[PDB]
Amino acid sequence: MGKVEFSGKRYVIDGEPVTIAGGTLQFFRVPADAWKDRLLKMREAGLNTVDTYVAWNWHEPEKGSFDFKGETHPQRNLVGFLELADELGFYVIIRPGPYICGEWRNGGIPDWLIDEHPEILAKGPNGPLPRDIYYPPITYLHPTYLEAVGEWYNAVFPVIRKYLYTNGGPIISVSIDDEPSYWETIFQPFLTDYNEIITKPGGLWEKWLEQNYTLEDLRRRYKGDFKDYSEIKVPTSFSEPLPKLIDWHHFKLWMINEYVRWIYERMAREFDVPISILDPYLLQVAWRHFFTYMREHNLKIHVWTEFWYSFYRSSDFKEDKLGHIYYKTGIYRYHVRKAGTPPLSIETQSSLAHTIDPTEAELLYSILPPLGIPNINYYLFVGGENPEGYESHNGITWDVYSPVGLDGSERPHFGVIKALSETMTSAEGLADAELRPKVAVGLYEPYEALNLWGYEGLEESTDLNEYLLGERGLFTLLAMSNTPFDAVDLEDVTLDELLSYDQLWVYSLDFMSREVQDKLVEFVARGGNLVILPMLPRYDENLEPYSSLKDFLGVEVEREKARRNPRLIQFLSVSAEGIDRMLVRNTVRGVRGGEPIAFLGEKPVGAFVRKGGGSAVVLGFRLQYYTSHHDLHRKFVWKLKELQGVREDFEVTNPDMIVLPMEGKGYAYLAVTNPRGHPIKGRISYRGLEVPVLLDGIELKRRGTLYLPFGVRKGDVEVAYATATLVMWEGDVLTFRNHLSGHSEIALKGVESVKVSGGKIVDGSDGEVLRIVIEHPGEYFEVELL
Amino acid sequence: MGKVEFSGKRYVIDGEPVTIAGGTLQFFRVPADAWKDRLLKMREAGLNTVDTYVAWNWHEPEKGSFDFKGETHPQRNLVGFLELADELGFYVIIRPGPYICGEWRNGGIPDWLIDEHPEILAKGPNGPLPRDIYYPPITYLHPTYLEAVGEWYNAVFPVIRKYLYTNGGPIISVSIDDEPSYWETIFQPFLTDYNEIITKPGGLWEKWLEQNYTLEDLRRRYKGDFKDYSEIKVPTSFSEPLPKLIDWHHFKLWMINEYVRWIYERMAREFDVPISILDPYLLQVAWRHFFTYMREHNLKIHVWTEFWYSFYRSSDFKEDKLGHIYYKTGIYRYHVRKAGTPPLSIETQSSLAHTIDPTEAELLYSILPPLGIPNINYYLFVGGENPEGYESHNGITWDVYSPVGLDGSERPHFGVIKALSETMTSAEGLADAELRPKVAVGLYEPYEALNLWGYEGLEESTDLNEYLLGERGLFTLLAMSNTPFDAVDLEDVTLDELLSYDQLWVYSLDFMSREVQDKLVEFVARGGNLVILPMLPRYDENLEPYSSLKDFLGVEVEREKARRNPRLIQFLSVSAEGIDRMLVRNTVRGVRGGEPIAFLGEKPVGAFVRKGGGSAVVLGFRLQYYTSHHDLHRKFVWKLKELQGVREDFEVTNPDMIVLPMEGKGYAYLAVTNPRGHPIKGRISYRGLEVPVLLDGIELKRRGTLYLPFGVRKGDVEVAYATATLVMWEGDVLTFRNHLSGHSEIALKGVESVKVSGGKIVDGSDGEVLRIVIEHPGEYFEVELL
Ligand SMILES: N[C@@H]1[C@@H](O)[C@H](O)[C@@H](CO)O[C@H]1O
Ligand SMILES: N[C@@H]1[C@@H](O)[C@H](O)[C@@H](CO)O[C@H]1O
């Protein structure tokens, strides 16, 4: 019967592509007598999909007693919820754990398991962890754990199976665990896991060492005199060799990988819909290890992501967050496009901030499609409450500003979700259209680890949160400079992939593998344009001296140590052509050789070198997002792009108008956004076409986003452009939305006349085109083709 | 001829009270041909005062080479700027340093001084500080530094004296240095200052010790066996008695005080206008030591404050900030009102955030008058540029989103400043009206120091930023529960002052002085109502066992250590009557004895006692601002208020409508604000009135604030209430502003009928009270009395 398939960027249900617009309704945390009303409110919001966990400890409250029908509590009626969601026309994404996070007791793991079998608990290097901590960590690969999970799955899997879309029910995907990260302990490298199955002679650590390295390799890599693998003790402090620390991290990722494989093999045998997972490891760059392991073991897993930015404070989704969002969507889509599964955000923050400003929510949600993710689930969409004994992180409450309250109230971001869902499910060709940046950023996994840890040994700081990702990060600068970027894994990426970009930015610390340094050399030599900062690498992956990149480039970068104490971090000024005293923070390194292009006083601190038809810019400083009237940071980006020949497909008159062109075959949708949120006006050019023509500019009165059609066609009729979002085109009626100003300009080919409702034509022109300006007193208006 | 006096809350100029509405125009950073136009823009904003620094290193670029007239650079023409400001009818606040901060090179200190005399530099405990750090720190009491400062003052003081308001010029105050804080090093207790003049035998530390304590005292306080003061070496680490660390902190404050007095003695000789200072120490609760010092040396200094919340990122002035602003305004006005000088914010952030949302700016600024500060200077008001060689923190730019840009453009918070300043200068009786809370918080200065350091030696955590001050702090919870509060210094406050409140909240750590413990006992014995959390003190100021408060209360509190590792900090649920599973964080202590009122499972963790004539609520947990549908943290505050009989003078139907009553002699103004910013509707009860009567609730559509008149009158005519701000009443014309909804209700007594302009009457009633509901299409409308 029913079919759930996938192609390109979408799931395909019974042979029709569908864009997922989902809300999370955790049935087990919402009164059963309210489920139907709340699903009707999701219908009203334009959602086609419902996401829910299934919690082990909820449905098996005592060992051996399973309740999926509401026999012991009406909120244990999984069966009834799945039947109701189906009757009401929803797809279901189901997430049966065992771990479900969810701010729920033990993340779904039963106390009766942990209390009876404390030997499964993960341990610290000096003994047990405390027991009153949230989500008690567990040693994944302990057989007693796995056996118990298997018994959970044996109960719940037959219910899932019966209700799969392929069997006449609603369920379209089953997810593995929940963002498995060692129970949110991977961030702290010596908190976990020292369980004896790991650390004993012949234990998992020793076996993993033996599978990955020769003993001699480890003697050289860790600078040790080992006579047997059993002599290489688990690390317990930052005084141990950095290579060994990196290995300990990757060992943990390996154990998570084995756990995920174990679950996958059970799910794959039982279910013929897509098997999914959310944010493996709670890392991003380290996904390289996940996708490689999937390929190695033929695991057909659909990896999904999430976007969370504010917890237990008001929302804070403004221009500051763009760097991080661009980075995360970038590295996500790099891997998922190569796996061939649809990009999807299974958790898109809609709760857990105390007050969610609708314009900030709009910015977050609406930037996901141009950044490659058109399939979006809002979490938590339906507010709830925690049954007694199942509280964890919020006490009784599970309604922290959800779009629909526990009482059925509608909060302001409900209407944001509704408007964007209508567009995403209805606008022809939008989901399939793709941003195609001219620029890439090169990410390097080991640095993610170091940032996670706050590692301090090196010449350069590991505060990549500050210099790359955050409110002043380089990535935020690139976004706000109107420089869209792909993100690539520097170890995995091919030369041909790199050379597909006009400019590659690489942030370097002291060390960089031989394989990556040599690759960058080849990139440049073959015509690539590099920007590298704030130093060149001096060491390889083993911390042994190695500098092929630097030697090829023919410059020299002074040695200087970056500072960590905020009071001691310098405030310095760098000048360049057309750039008088641009602020830079922290230690600045002289760059000798090549053509000097930036200066700290009379000292060169950035240089340009050409090699064949390629080039490199080497900066001895951290370039960050700062803005002002003078706006030198943005200007410097633009000067580097001009130096290396980078030309975007679009131009703007107002630098605060951020444009992301979503290109399809013969058409595009330009996402046009105002992240700063102050009123802005300007013109845009796309591939040489300047818009608007009759209006003085596109006006965006506040923070928000438009998806402007360029070349969207049906038959012989084309929307050459519009300054309003084309929400849908049904028969001969075009529905447009412009919630950011009171007028819109539309340019049409192939039609002689129109009738407008919800507004008045106040201006127009041509033979070439039917151009009209419509004043509309609301957000929505319709143009009927005659 | 002119006189500058002061009474109450206001400076009194030529016999008349004036409300200060200022902007900073740092003439030295603004092109001289724009000064006039910028000052005229300030007059359009309703500003009556201009603030500026005078920079030593700018007007003395070489030793002995002074320029105050533009003889060497047009922006050195201080004299010309003062004449201009005077011609244009501005008051001037002048701030001649020597330190001026200002994101300016060395904070104003000449390089030729530091380069010739490095012996004046502050030292670290291990060696010199680095030379390339911002604001090179200086040993204030080094005779070579003070000689140099004296020469600066011998040059600029005659200029300032000529231009004093008392001598026919515009200058109404001269400020001392700038927030002297040991050059932003006081926060790190072991970064500074180990200059030999401090640390040597017979040096400033040893002399301070001997002035403050006997040797016998120090043996007790430090648990030591010293036979000489020379054995008591300066601390360089936390492996010192905690009292000794507190004394090292206080000794630095004393050095700052000495520096201030040295400056003050020179100024007082020269100047007969108020001598002012901004935020001594960059601390708040430590102001006790500054006011005590003022008293002890008979210094007449006017202490002013500042409000800054976002740096080098977008503004973020939402509900999360209210706890800190209530705290800081509270402790400021506690001290300043005892001093008898006017409350004034000399720097009210209007720049240095990348984009300032006007609603967030309005919340920041408009909350100051109801929190006791009607005199406000907006910094930086006029955007500028730094002369070459004088950059520090921003490179070339000094225009980071100022209200007036470098090019004279207006940014969106200009209009917010204009509208507030027009109201503060025109609304009769507004500036003199006073908040009179029912509740106070008791602040304890040693705990401020421990929060600065992140001190780890105690049972309780010193993370007061988290538990008291910040986004989830207790003080934000108080503010958002509609509980205005005063903030009192526990050490200084009299019993009489305490007993004037209906409830006192005290956050306690392990130790609390015998004086303060005993004062708390007396307070409850004499009828006071105490709330104390999350423990009772077990030690006195010398860390010897001392538990007078506990002993009097007759409770016992479990001993448990609070956690610092975020992964290990507990999430727990506390219940009470009406309160099912309210979230708490971190360790929870049983409280045995008294009437149990709060429970962790079956364990009492909060008790209520009645002792002497008063009462005390003792909580073994940290109460924080979390919100949700259930809203249990606000509800718990409400329950405790009820328990102890605390009744505000107002009631409100919407708990997000925050109300601060400003009480006058025969009238009041109710500040009504929407800090969360989502649209809110509600009704207010106040002064026996219901507001509104006809209109369907007061609507605040977005973040912002109204000052609603109650009882404002001229002769027989009285505004009983209105739901718009009364900005001015001139002749028979009342001018109202409601920029937060499109309808307002007015209630007048003594007048039979009115004429409206700017709106239409859409409902009304009479008889002893004329009530009209006006629909207005703009923010302002007028009511003329007939
Ligand atoms: N998958 C988790 C959710 O289960 C949790 O509810 C959400 C908010 O903390 O964080 C995401 O990482
Ligand atoms: N008095 C300083 C100012 O001089 C500075 O310009 C402002 C912004 O950082 O902070 C205050 O603390």
Q: DSSP letter at A539?
A: B
For residues A504 and B325, give the distance between their C-alpha atoms in angstroms, rounded to a whole number.
Answer: 45
Q: Note the helical H segments in A527-664.
A: 548-553, 632-644
Residues in Cβ contact with B319 at an 8 Å cutoff, skipping those fewer than 6 apart:
A314, A354, A355, B476, B480, B675, B676, B677
Distances (CA, A) of B206 to A524, B198, B232, B607: 64, 8, 8, 46
C-alpha distances in Å from residue B700, one per residue of B367, B658, B762? 15, 11, 19
The answer to whether B371 and B662 have CB atoms below 8 angstroms apart is no
With an 8 Å Cβ cutoff, are B583 and A184 in contact?
no
Residue A533 CA to residue A507 CA, distance in Å, equals 5
Question: Does the beta carbon of B465 lie under 8 angstroms from any beta carbon of chain A?
Answer: no
**Partners of residue A629 in chain B, C-beta under 8 Å:** 383, 397, 399-400, 405-407
Handedness of CA A635, A641, A642, A644 (dihedral sign): positive
Measured between alpha carbons, how far is A418 from A45 in angstroms, rounded to an integer? 4
Cis amide leading into B437 (omega within 30)? no
Q: What is the DSSP string of A340-375?
A: T---EEEEEE-SSSSS--HHHHHHHHHHTTTTT--E
For this entry, resolution in Å reads 1.3
Query: Are A630 and B393 within 8 A, CB to CB?
Result: no
**Omega of the bond leading into A282 within 30 degrees of 0 (cis):** no
Whole-number Å distance, alpha carbon B238 to ligand 2 midpoint, is 30
Which tokens belong to B626? 């979390």
Integer Cα distance of A692 and A461 in angstroms: 46
How far is Cα of residue B577 from the mean position of the Cα atoms in its chain? Answer: 36
Residue A781's Cβ-side half-sphere holds a number of Cα atoms within 13 Å equal to: 27
The answer for residues whose C-beta is within 8 angstroms of residue B400's C-beta and 6 or more apart is A627, A628, A629, B312, B351, B352, B353, B354, B380, B383, B394
Q: Report the distance separating Cα A663 and Cα B614, nearest Å.
A: 73
Q: Mind telling me how many Å the CA of A223 is from chain B's nearest CA?
A: 32
Query: Of the candidates B396, B308, B388, B392, which has an alpha carbon nearest to the alpha carbon of residue B356?
Result: B308
CA distance B461 to chain A (A): 17
Both tokens assigned to B248: 């090292």
Structure-token pair, residue B537:
């003190």
CB A467 within 8 A of CB A441: no
Instruction: Provide the token pair at A503.
Output: 């400019």
Ligand nearest to the CA of B380: 2
What gap in Å lies between CA B574 and CA B579, rounded to an integer? 8
Partners of B123 in beta bridges = B128
| Chain A CB contacts of B186 below 8 Å | none
Q: Which residues face B695 on adjacent strands?
A: none
Nearest to B63 by CA among B169, B161, B155: B155
Cβ A307 vs Cβ A317: under 8 Å: no
Distance, CA of A426 to CA of A431 (rounded, Å): 9
Measured CA to CA, the distance from residue A750 to residue A767 in angstroms comes to 11
Question: Locate tokens 């904070």: which residue?
Answer: B107
Both tokens assigned to B449: 């120091």
Using only C-alpha atoms, chain B has a radius of gyration, in whole angstroms, of 27
Mutation to probe ligand 1, out of A279, A347, A401 (largest number of atoms < 8 A from CB): A347
Question: Are A320 and B314 an interchain contact pair (Cβ–Cβ within 8 Å)?
Answer: yes
A132 CB contacts (<8 Å, ≥6 apart)? Answer: B570, B572
Contacts of A99 (CB under 8 A, 6+ apart): A107, A108, A109, A135, A177, A178, A180, A183
Q: Is A347 a catalytic residue?
A: yes
Q: How far is CA B479 from CA A353, B40, B534, B659, B667, in A?
A: 18, 38, 19, 10, 24
Token digits of residue A616:
């490199």
Q: What are the φ/ψ torsions at residue A212 (nearest 5 degrees)?
A: -110, -25
Quote the tokens at residue B615. 């009462």
Judge: B626–A472 Cβ closer than 8 Å, yes or no: no
> Which residue, among B731, B688, B686, has the nearest Cα to B707 in the 3D structure?
B686
CA dist., res. B17 & res. B9, Å (int): 9
Residue A223's contacts (CB-CB under 8 Å, 6 or more residues apart) are A241
Amino acid occupying residue A179: E
Rounded to whole angstroms, how far apart are CA atoms A271 and A166?
Answer: 9
Please classify residue A579 by burial: count the beta carbons closer than 10 Å to its beta carbon, then call 0-12 exposed, 13-18 middle and 19+ buried: buried
Residue A168 CB contacts under 8 Å (≥ 6 apart), including other chains: A1, A2
CA distance A192 to B568: 13
A603: buried, middle or exposed (CB in 10 Å: 19+, 13-18, 0-12)?
middle
Q: Do residues A645 and A607 touch, judged by C-beta distance below 8 A?
A: no
Cα separation, B184 vs B137, whole angstroms: 8
- DSSP label of B123: B
B572: enclosing H helix or E strand: strand B571-576
- Give the distance (Å) from ligand 2 centre to CA of residue A498: 45
What is the bridge-based pairing of β-strands B614-619 and B529-533?
parallel
Instruction: Report the C-alpha gap between A82 and A163 in whole angstroms.
Output: 7
Q: Is residue B699 lining ligand 2, measured as CB closer than 6 Å? A: no
Neighbours of B397 (CB within 10 A): 25
Q: First CA to last CA across chain A, in angstroms?
A: 42
What does residue B748 show for φ and ψ, rounded to 5 degrees?
-115, 145
User: Which structure tokens are listed for B244?
Assistant: 């000794």
Q: What is the number of other CB atoms lying within 10 angstroms of the CB of residue A755?
A: 12
DSSP string, B636-660: HHHHHHHHTT---SEEESSTTSEEE
Q: Cα angle vertex A32, ends A28, A34, to 5°?
A: 115
Cα–Cα dist A741/A762, whole Å = 15
Q: Encode A29-73 in three state secondary structure.
A: HCCHHHHHHHHHHHHHCCCCEEEEECCHHHHCCECCECCCCCCCC
CB contact set of A388 (below 8 Å; sequence gap of 6+): B581
Angle (nearest 5°) at CA B593 between B589 and B598? 50
Label each residue of B669-724 as H, E or C. EEEEECCCCCCEEECEEECCEEECCCCCCEEECCCCEEEEEECEEECCEEEEEECC
DSSP annotation of A321 reads: G
Those residues whose C-beta lies under 8 Å from the C-beta of residue B184, and which sit 6 or more positions away, are: A567, B134, B135, B137, B282
| 3-state DSSP assignment of residue A775 | strand
- The strand pairing partners of A783, in sequence order, are A734, A756
Vertex A137 angle, CA A131 and A140, to 5°: 140
Residue of A329, A409, A315 lying closest to A369 (CA atoms):
A329
Phi then psi for A708, rounded to 5 degrees? -90, 130
Instruction: Let me know: does A306 contact A462? Beta carbons within 8 Å.
Output: no
* Pocket of ligand 2 contains residue B103 by CB under 6 Å: yes
Task: Return the structure tokens found at A326.
Answer: 């661009």
Instruction: Please state, in angstroms and rounded to a whole number, the distance separating the CA atoms of residues A740 and A744.
Output: 10
Please name the residues in contact with A623: beta carbons below 8 A apart, sequence gap of 6 or more.
A474, A477, A533, A584, A633, A636, A637
Q: By the 8 A CB rule, do B128 and B62 touch? A: no
CA atoms of B330 and B504, how far apart (whole Å): 14
Distance CA A236, CA A220 (A): 20
The Cβ of residue A679 has, within 10 Å, a number of other Cβ atoms equal to 14
Compute the distance between CA of residue B75 and CA of residue B32 in angstroms, rounded to an integer.
6
First to last CA, chain B: 43
A-B Cβ pairs (cutoff 8 Å, strict)? 166
Token pair, residue B329, equals: 């305004």
Q: What angle do CA B517, B521, B527 make, to 5 degrees?
A: 145
Strand partners, A539: A511, A545
Question: Residue with structure tokens 């860790």?
Answer: A222
CA–CA gap between residue B275 and residue B263 (Å, rounded): 10
DSSP string covering A723-738 = SSEEEEEETTEEEEE-
Q: Give the separation between CA A589 and CA A560, rounded to whole angstroms.
A: 6
**Is the distance from the beta carbon of residue B347 to the nearest atom of ligand 2 less than 6 Å?**
yes
Nearest to B508 by CA among B552, B564, B450: B450
Instruction: Give the integer Cα–Cα distance in Å for A214 and B563.
Output: 42
Q: Distance between CA B371 and CA B434 in Å, rounded?
A: 8
In the sheet with B434-435, reading across from the earlier edge strand, the strands are B434-435, B658-663, B668-673, B705-710
Q: What would the two tokens of residue B582 be?
A: 């309210």
Q: Are A316 and A357 in contact (CB under 8 A)?
A: no
Question: What is the token pair recorded at B485?
Answer: 């509060």
Burial of residue A239 (number of CB atoms within 10 Å: 0-12, 13-18, 19+): exposed
Residue type, B516: V
Q: Give CA separation, B551 vs B517, B518, B529, B538, in Å.
A: 10, 11, 17, 10
Adjacency order of strands within the sheet including B650-652: B650-652, B684-686, B689-691
Which residues from A are below 8 Å from B314, CB to CB? Answer: 318-320, 471, 676
Question: What sign does the dihedral A510-A516-A522-A524 (CA atoms) show?
Answer: negative
- Bridge partners, residue B398, by sequence: B384
Please give the Cα distance from A52 to A97 (Å, whole number). Answer: 11
Nearest residue to A478 via CA among A644, A623, A628, A684: A623
- Of B491, B520, B451, give the one whose Cα is nearest residue B291: B491
> Active-site residue B448, yes or no?
no
CA angle B501, B502, B507 (to 5 degrees): 80
Long-range pairs, A468-471, Cβ under 8 A, ≥24: A468/A323, A468/A327, A468/A507, A469/A323, A469/A324, A469/A327, A470/A320, A470/A323, A470/A324, A471/A320, A471/A321, A471/A323, A471/A625, A471/B312, A471/B313, A471/B314
Torsion angle defined by CA atoms of residues A250, A254, A257 and A262, in that order, rounded to the nearest 10 degrees: -170
A27: which 2 tokens?
Answer: 């049935």
Tell me, using a 6 A CB cutoff, whether residue B352 lines ligand 2.
yes
Q: Which of B60, B319, B347, B448 is catalytic?
A: B347
Q: Does B313 touch chain A (CB under 8 A)?
A: yes
List of residues 6+ apart from A496 with CB closer than 8 A: none
Structure tokens at B754: 């009115």
The answer to whether residues B692 and B683 touch, using CB atoms and an 8 Å cutoff, is yes
**Which B-chain residues 172-191 have CB contacts (< 8 A) with chain A?**
184-185, 187-188, 191
Output the CA angle A498-A578-A684, nearest 5 degrees.
Answer: 65
Which residues touch A432 (CB under 8 Å, ≥6 apart)? A8, A9, A10, A664
